[PDB]
Amino acid sequence: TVSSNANFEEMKNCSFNATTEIKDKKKNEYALFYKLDIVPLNGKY
Amino acid sequence: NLWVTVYYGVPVWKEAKTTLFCASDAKAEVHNVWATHACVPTDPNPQEMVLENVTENFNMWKNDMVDQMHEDVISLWDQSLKPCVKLTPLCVTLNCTNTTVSSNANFEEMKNCSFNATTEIKDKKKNEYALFYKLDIVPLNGKYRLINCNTSACTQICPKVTFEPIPIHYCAPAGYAILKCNNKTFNGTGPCNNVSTVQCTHGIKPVVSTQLLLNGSLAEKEIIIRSENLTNNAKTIIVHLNESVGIVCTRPSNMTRKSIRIGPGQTFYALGDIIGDIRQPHCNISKQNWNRTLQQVGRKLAEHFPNRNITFNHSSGGDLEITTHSFNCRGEFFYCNTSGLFNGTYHPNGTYNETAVNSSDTITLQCRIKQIINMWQEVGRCMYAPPIAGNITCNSNITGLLLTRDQTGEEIFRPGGGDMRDNWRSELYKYKVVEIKPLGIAPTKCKRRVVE
Amino acid sequence: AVGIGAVFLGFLGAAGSTMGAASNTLTVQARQLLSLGVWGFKQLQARVLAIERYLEVQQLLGIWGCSGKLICCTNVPWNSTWSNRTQEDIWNNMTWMEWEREIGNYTHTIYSLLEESQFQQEINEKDLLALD
Amino acid sequence: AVGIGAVFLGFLGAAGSTMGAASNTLTVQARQLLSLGVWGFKQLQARVLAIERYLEVQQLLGIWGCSGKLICCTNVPWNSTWSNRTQEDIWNNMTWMEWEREIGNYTHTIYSLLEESQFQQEINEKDLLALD
Numbered sequence: 001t002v003s004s005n006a007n008f009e010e011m012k013n014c015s016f017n018a019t020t021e022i023k024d025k026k027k028n029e030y031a032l033f034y035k036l037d038i039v040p041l042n043g044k045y
Numbered sequence: 046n047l048w049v050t051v052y053y054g055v056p057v058w059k060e061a062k063t064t065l066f067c068a069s070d071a072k073a074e075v076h077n078v079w080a081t082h083a084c085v086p087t088d089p090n091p092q093e094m095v096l097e098n099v100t101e102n103f104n105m106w107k108n109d110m111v112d113q114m115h116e117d118v119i120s121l122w123d124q125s126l127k128p129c130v131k132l133t134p135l136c137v138t139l140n141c142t143n144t145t146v147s148s149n150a151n152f153e154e155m156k157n158c159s160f161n162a163t164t165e166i167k168d169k170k171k172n173e174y175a176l177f178y179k180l181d182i183v184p185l186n187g188k189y190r191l192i193n194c195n196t197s198a199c200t201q202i203c204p205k206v207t208f209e210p211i212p213i214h215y216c217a218p219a220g221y222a223i224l225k226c227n228n229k230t231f232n233g234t235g236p237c238n239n240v241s242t243v244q245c246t247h248g249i250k251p252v253v254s255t256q257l258l259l260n261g262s263l264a265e266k267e268i269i270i271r272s273e274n275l276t277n278n279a280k281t282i283i284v285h286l287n288e289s290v291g292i293v294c295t296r297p298s299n300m301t302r303k304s305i306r307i308g309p310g311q312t313f314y315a316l317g318d319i320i321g322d323i324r325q326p327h328c329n330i331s332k333q334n335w336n337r338t339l340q341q342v343g344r345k346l347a348e349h350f351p352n353r354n355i356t357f358n359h360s361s362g363g364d365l366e367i368t369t370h371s372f373n374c375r376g377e378f379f380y381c382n383t384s385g386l387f388n389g390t391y392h393p394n395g396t397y398n399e400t401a402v403n404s405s406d407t408i409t410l411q412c413r414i415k416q417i418i419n420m421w422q423e424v425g426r427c428m429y430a431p432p433i434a435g436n437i438t439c440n441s442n443i444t445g446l447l448l449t450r451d452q453t454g455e456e457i458f459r460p461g462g463g464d465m466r467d468n469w470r471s472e473l474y475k476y477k478v479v480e481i482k483p484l485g486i487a488p489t490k491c492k493r494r495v496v497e
Numbered sequence: 498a499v500g501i502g503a504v505f506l507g508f509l510g511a512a513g514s515t516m517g518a519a520s521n522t523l524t525v526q527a528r529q530l531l532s533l534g535v536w537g538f539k540q541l542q543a544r545v546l547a548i549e550r551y552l553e554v555q556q557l558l559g560i561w562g563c564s565g566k567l568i569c570c571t572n573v574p575w576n577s578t579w580s581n582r583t584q585e586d587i588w589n590n591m592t593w594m595e596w597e598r599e600i601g602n603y604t605h606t607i608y609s610l611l612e613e614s615q616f617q618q619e620i621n622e623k624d625l626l627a628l629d
Numbered sequence: 630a631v632g633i634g635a636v637f638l639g640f641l642g643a644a645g646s647t648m649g650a651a652s653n654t655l656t657v658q659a660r661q662l663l664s665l666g667v668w669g670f671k672q673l674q675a676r677v678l679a680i681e682r683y684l685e686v687q688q689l690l691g692i693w694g695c696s697g698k699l700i701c702c703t704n705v706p707w708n709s710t711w712s713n714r715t716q717e718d719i720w721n722n723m724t725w726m727e728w729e730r731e732i733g734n735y736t737h738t739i740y741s742l743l744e745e746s747q748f749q750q751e752i753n754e755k756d757l758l759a760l761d
């Protein structure tokens with residue numbers, strides 16, 4: 001989401017739990033990935 | 046008439062750059078980091094010839110030998126650390142607290158840290174406790190974590206290998222030679238009128254130190270001062286002593302070595318507990334041997350800096366790796382607070398008779414232990430030093446000093462290990478690899494005969 | 498002072514002496530020529546380096562006709578431009594190191610002349626053997 | 630029994646025969662001299678080893694003046710201390726292996742003499758050609 005632009009179905013805002021510097025703790029992080037590098041599942045990728 | 050003739054095997058040499066290989070006496074499964082067992086035996090009595098009527102220039106600041114073997118050490122260290130455990134799983138929350146036992150009052154240097162460590166089987170986890178020094182753990186917003194968790198995975202030294210400083214000889218191939226100077230008052234750069242040719246060098250012990258050169262060779266005639274540009278204060282100064290001063294350093298404590306399992310096939314050793322009282326490490330230096338030694342070097346500096354008061358002060362500060370005198374003792378990394386050593390100044394005019402200072406007086410020092418080390422002044426590697434059961438004691442001799450200079454009147458000299466390469470420059474200052482050119486052409490009256 | 502036969506001298510000996518005196522110690526220098534781990538690679542690189550350096554000198558000697566001769570005369574004459582000093586002051590007043598330094602600029606020209614001269618010594622000799 | 634020309638014999642042949650008989654089979658031995666993976670390193674180590682061994686013998690031959698000669702006479706005389714046996718019993722009553730074992734102790738002394746003698750053969754020859 002941001003304010004051609006209509007055809008935005010090539011990059012998706014993916015969020016995941018990424019391990020921090022310490023193994024036990026995990027924190028949420030977000031990054032953009034192209035549609036050619038991620039596949040869906042039976043609504044997660 | 047004169048004719049041209051060709052001579053083979055003339056005594057002519059030209060400066061060149063070439064590779065070198067190690068050579069050391071047989072020693073004897075025993076494992077060594079330097080792999081001296083793989084080095085070539087040198088000789089009982091190597092051949093050395095003293096040349097005459099020859100003068101050759103020397104320049105140790107542009108010597109490839111120091112640059113060459115500098116890259117050898119890091120490769121050797123990297124070579125031996127590949128088959129060793131990695132301490133990535135240890136990056137877990139630490140529940141540390143004051144150690145309790147029945148000086149002892151100042152116990153804020155080691156904490157009893159507890160954490161959940163994975164057993165042989167991955168799913169199960171059990172609680173374990175170990176002792177860690179204050180310098181290797183940092184707090185959080187009341188828990189602690191290892192310092193290296195956010196920088197890089199830090200490996201472990203396998204206890205099987207020992208990294209004591211075994212002397213080694215760097216020897217060149219055939220067709221090349223190493224030229225050795227013998228002038229007792231030879232500085233870093235200048236002509237040498239007593240050059241002697243040798244197949245290769247003498248035993249050189251690789252020692253890692255910052256402010257003081259230890260258990261090394263001594264100057265013959267007098268104190269030698271070497272520096273590429275003395276007038277420039279941005280370059281380090283190497284001092285070689287003709288009289289050495291002994292140093293005794295120890296970590297007096299019997300600390301049980303406890304093996305902790307952190308994963309399948311992975312096990313690392315830590316400090317178990319303390320049997321007795323808490324007592325800090327220390328180093329002892331005789332007062333007279335240091336006061337006199339700083340007296341002799343003081344007058345030597347007077348010639349280079351005439352009619353200038355010379356004073357020796359402690360290091361500025363900042364990072365602990367170079368501020369303190371870092372060295373090794375049985376595999377334990379020390380960091381000694383060197384502030385009381387440089388607490389005096391030389392007066393060019395005055396009386397300095399040594400009998401005034403009382404004898405049997407030593408200079409006690411405060412030193413701290415850091416078992417997580419990053420080497421070569423680069424954050425790209427680490428190594429966890431395992432502990433040793435019982436108390437250790439290492440005795441050595443101070444050989445040289447690494448000082449730095451920094452508007453009128455008093456001249457301030459401070460200790461500092463600006464670069465690691467200067468440690469070996471004090472040993473290879475009198476060596477130079479050279480290439481042989483046995484071809485010679487000169488005129489003569491002899492003419493080749495042609496058969497008709 | 499007792500005498501040394503010059504065969505007992507060490508490597509690079511007589512370097513600071515006169516050229517004529519050093520001409521009697523050529524043998525000792527010739528003897529020293531060709532005397533998985535990290536050390537093995539460096540040692541292996543050293544062995545090939547020694548072989549390459551020795552073979553470079555022998556290759557030049559073979560073309561010049563001094564394949565095995567330690568001291569060999571040639572037919573090309575000496576040019577005064579390369580050196581102007583007399584024979585007396587060359588063999589008895591300076592060392593080999595200074596001499597090579599002086600004429601290091603003309604080394605390329607002399608090397609080509611020896612190859613050209615010796616090659617000419619072969620074709621004309623062959624013509625003489627064809628008259629039988 | 631049909632005759633073999635001694636050129637058809639294999640490597641190390643005639644080792645158990647007399648020294649005189651084995652002197653006619655020197656050619657065959659000379660021919661065999663200089664005939665990323667784990668194997669490559671060992672194979673590479675083998676190639677350099679063969680070159681080093683072959684060059685060591687040739688270096689000694691060049692100094693002695695037998696640069697290319699397979700059989701070469703010299704000017705140094707033989708010492709009775711090194712060997713006391715007569716010529717008849719040496720070339721026709723024992724093998725080369727026994728001979729080298731017998732005189733293995735005196736090899737160092739003989740080697741130095743050849744260099745000293747041959748080196749002397751060069752300087753005096755040079756003096757003769759300077760009279761033109």
Ligand SMILES: *[C@@H]1O[C@H](CO)[C@@H](O[C@@H]2O[C@H](CO)[C@@H](O[C@@H]3O[C@H](CO[C@H]4O[C@H](CO[C@H]5O[C@H](CO)[C@@H](O)[C@H](O)[C@@H]5O[C@H]5O[C@H](CO)[C@@H](O)[C@H](O)[C@@H]5O)[C@@H](O)[C@H](O[C@H]5O[C@H](CO)[C@@H](O)[C@H](O)[C@@H]5O)[C@@H]4O)[C@@H](O)[C@H](O[C@H]4O[C@H](CO)[C@@H](O)[C@H](O)[C@@H]4O[C@H]4O[C@H](CO)[C@@H](O)[C@H](O)[C@@H]4O)[C@@H]3O)[C@H](O)[C@H]2NC(C)=O)[C@H](O)[C@H]1NC(C)=O
Pocket residue numbers: 089090091092093094095212227239241243247248
């Ligand atoms: C120009 O420079 C020249 C070179 O410096 C110089 O020549 C030298 O002169 C001095 C002064 O005259 C000589 O010093 C004497 O040395 C004796 C020992 O010599 C032997 O050992 C030497 C060192 O050997 C090590 O280092 C070598 C380095 O290349 C290695 O090759 C060796 O393998 C060996 O390495 C081992 O040891 C190292 C540490 O030592 C170690 O790092 C290494 O890893 C390894 O373990 C050798 O160089 C020397 O070799 C020469 O001589 C032998 C024959 O002897 C030859 O075969 C060699 O080919 C070579 O030519 C020797 O092997 C000392 O014992 C001697 O001490 C006595 O004398 C002094 C002064 O007189 C006294 O202060 C001292 O106390 C001793 O006297 C005491 O005892 C006696 C009883 O014995 C008693 O009567 C007396 O009253 C007193 O109480 C002395 O120091 C030096 O040997 C000369 N040569 C060399 C090469 O250094 C020359 O003068 C200069 N001037 C010019 C040319 O004008």
Ligand SMILES: *[C@@H]1O[C@H](CO)[C@@H](O[C@@H]2O[C@H](CO)[C@@H](O[C@@H]3O[C@H](CO[C@H]4O[C@H](CO)[C@@H](O)[C@H](O)[C@@H]4O)[C@@H](O)[C@H](O[C@H]4O[C@H](CO)[C@@H](O)[C@H](O)[C@@H]4O)[C@@H]3O)[C@H](O)[C@H]2NC(C)=O)[C@H](O)[C@H]1NC(C)=O
Pocket residue numbers: 207209210252259260372373374375439440441442
């Ligand atoms: C500058 O140079 C000095 C001079 O060498 C160094 O001081 C020596 O350092 C070495 C290495 O640290 C010390 O060697 C150690 O000695 C210990 C005690 O040895 C004595 O006692 C035992 C019995 O306890 C006797 O058997 C022995 O003969 C001695 O009488 C040893 O316990 C140590 O053993 C280590 O090596 C063995 C080898 O197999 C291993 O199995 C062990 O596990 C262990 O790792 C070690 O050998 C030596 O004592 C020091 N003093 C002297 C006079 O040599 C300085 O350390 C050095 N400084 C720097 C910064 O380089």
Ligand SMILES: *[C@@H]1O[C@H](CO)[C@@H](O[C@@H]2O[C@H](CO)[C@@H](O[C@@H]3O[C@H](CO[C@H]4O[C@H](CO)[C@@H](O)[C@H](O)[C@@H]4O)[C@@H](O)[C@H](O[C@H]4O[C@H](CO)[C@@H](O)[C@H](O)[C@@H]4O)[C@@H]3O)[C@H](O)[C@H]2NC(C)=O)[C@H](O)[C@H]1NC(C)=O
Pocket residue numbers: 336337339340343388389390391402
């Ligand atoms: C060999 O060993 C001797 C002694 O064992 C050492 O000599 C000592 O050196 C220190 C350092 O200089 C002396 O300590 C003091 O140094 C002061 C330097 O002056 C500056 O700093 C003061 C600090 O307040 C400033 O006020 C001043 O303006 C300067 O900026 C001196 O000023 C001190 O003098 C005072 O004490 C002496 C005591 O001896 C009195 O006689 C004076 O009147 C004055 O009150 C003081 O000297 C120390 O005193 C020296 N001890 C002696 C001489 O016995 C050598 O340094 C050491 N060798 C080496 C190479 O270090």
Ligand SMILES: *[C@@H]1O[C@H](CO)[C@@H](O[C@@H]2O[C@H](CO)[C@@H](O)[C@H](O)[C@H]2NC(C)=O)[C@H](O)[C@H]1NC(C)=O
Pocket residue numbers: 001013015029030
């Ligand atoms: C991608 O998604 C993340 C959330 O997973 C967005 O992050 C939030 O963005 C909003 C609006 O920009 C902020 O108000 C929040 O504070 C952000 N939260 C976090 C945890 O980052 C991110 O903006 C999205 N980016 C795009 C390009 O769509």
Ligand SMILES: *[C@@H]1O[C@H](CO)[C@@H](O[C@@H]2O[C@H](CO)[C@@H](O)[C@H](O)[C@H]2NC(C)=O)[C@H](O)[C@H]1NC(C)=O
Pocket residue numbers: 015016017028
């Ligand atoms: C990331 O971690 C968070 C918690 O740290 C997870 O949040 C839980 O997700 C499960 C999914 O089965 C829910 O049942 C819980 O109710 C969630 N808890 C909270 C507090 O929200 C999250 O599922 C993890 N995964 C992702 C992709 O965010």
Ligand SMILES: *[C@@H]1O[C@H](CO)[C@@H](O[C@@H]2O[C@H](CO)[C@@H](O)[C@H](O)[C@H]2NC(C)=O)[C@H](O)[C@H]1NC(C)=O
Pocket residue numbers: 143144145157159174317318319
């Ligand atoms: C460090 O802390 C651990 C606990 O995390 C201590 O271990 C306990 O010690 C007490 C008294 O010595 C025993 O009664 C318990 O049985 C121990 N429990 C475990 C799980 O070890 C340990 O003693 C402390 N060590 C120091 C030096 O303070």
Ligand SMILES: *[C@@H]1O[C@H](CO)[C@@H](O[C@@H]2O[C@H](CO)[C@@H](O)[C@H](O)[C@H]2NC(C)=O)[C@H](O)[C@H]1NC(C)=O
Pocket residue numbers: 138139140159160161172
């Ligand atoms: C180690 O593991 C134990 C359990 O195996 C953990 O104990 C739990 O810790 C959480 C912390 O959020 C508490 O909420 C639970 O109540 C604890 N359970 C029990 C039974 O004590 C412990 O936190 C882990 N970490 C450390 C450092 O011990």
Ligand SMILES: *[C@@H]1O[C@H](CO)[C@@H](O[C@@H]2O[C@H](CO)[C@@H](O)[C@H](O)[C@H]2NC(C)=O)[C@H](O)[C@H]1NC(C)=O
Pocket residue numbers: 352354391392393394395454455
């Ligand atoms: C250098 O140090 C000397 C002493 O080590 C200083 O000598 C003293 O100087 C002060 C003046 O600053 C005089 O009052 C004293 O009388 C001097 N001492 C003696 C024993 O006479 C000297 O001043 C310092 N500075 C310079 C430039 O030399």
Ligand SMILES: *[C@@H]1O[C@H](CO)[C@@H](O[C@@H]2O[C@H](CO)[C@@H](O)[C@H](O)[C@H]2NC(C)=O)[C@H](O)[C@H]1NC(C)=O
Pocket residue numbers: 352353393394
């Ligand atoms: C004795 O002390 C004097 C101090 O005056 C030293 O010489 C003087 O040093 C100052 C340093 O600021 C110079 O300005 C003077 O010019 C010097 N005096 C002379 C005459 O040149 C002198 O070096 C000391 N003696 C010794 C042996 O060091």
Ligand SMILES: *[C@@H]1O[C@H](CO)[C@@H](O[C@@H]2O[C@H](CO)[C@@H](O)[C@H](O)[C@H]2NC(C)=O)[C@H](O)[C@H]1NC(C)=O
Pocket residue numbers: 396397398399400401
């Ligand atoms: C030379 O050394 C002697 C050795 O003691 C010093 O003499 C001492 O001086 C102090 C202070 O004046 C006295 O308290 C001692 O009683 C003296 N002892 C002796 C044995 O005489 C002397 O001061 C030194 N010379 C100096 C500093 O110039």
Ligand SMILES: *[C@@H]1O[C@H](CO)[C@@H](O[C@@H]2O[C@H](CO)[C@@H](O)[C@H](O)[C@H]2NC(C)=O)[C@H](O)[C@H]1NC(C)=O
Pocket residue numbers: 403404405406
């Ligand atoms: C250095 O100072 C100490 C101070 O304890 C001196 O120790 C004295 O030594 C003498 C002779 O051994 C004893 O009679 C005294 O009782 C000691 N003093 C005590 C115990 O307080 C030592 O002598 C001094 N150094 C020198 C060289 O005199």
Ligand SMILES: *[C@@H]1O[C@H](CO)[C@@H](O)[C@H](O)[C@H]1NC(C)=O
Pocket residue numbers: 140141142
């Ligand atoms: C950490 O140690 C303190 C020591 O008093 C203890 O109270 C606390 O419970 C420990 N942490 C956990 C999670 O048990």
Ligand SMILES: *[C@@H]1O[C@H](CO)[C@@H](O)[C@H](O)[C@H]1NC(C)=O
Pocket residue numbers: 142143
């Ligand atoms: C450890 O001892 C120091 C000494 O003053 C004290 O300040 C600190 O609070 C103690 N820590 C714990 C956890 O008791």
Ligand SMILES: *[C@@H]1O[C@H](CO)[C@@H](O)[C@H](O)[C@H]1NC(C)=O
Pocket residue numbers: 227228229230231238239
């Ligand atoms: C070495 O050179 C210095 C000067 O550079 C000279 O004073 C000394 O005597 C020389 N050493 C000798 C001759 O042994």
Ligand SMILES: *[C@@H]1O[C@H](CO)[C@@H](O)[C@H](O)[C@H]1NC(C)=O
Pocket residue numbers: 232233234235236272273274275
């Ligand atoms: C070293 O010695 C030479 C000759 O004795 C001298 O010219 C030079 O200034 C000295 N210092 C340095 C840094 O080279």
Ligand SMILES: *[C@@H]1O[C@H](CO)[C@@H](O)[C@H](O)[C@H]1NC(C)=O
Pocket residue numbers: 265266267268287288341
């Ligand atoms: C060391 O050199 C200093 C220079 O002043 C001299 O006073 C001292 O006697 C020398 N000591 C030795 C053992 O050579």
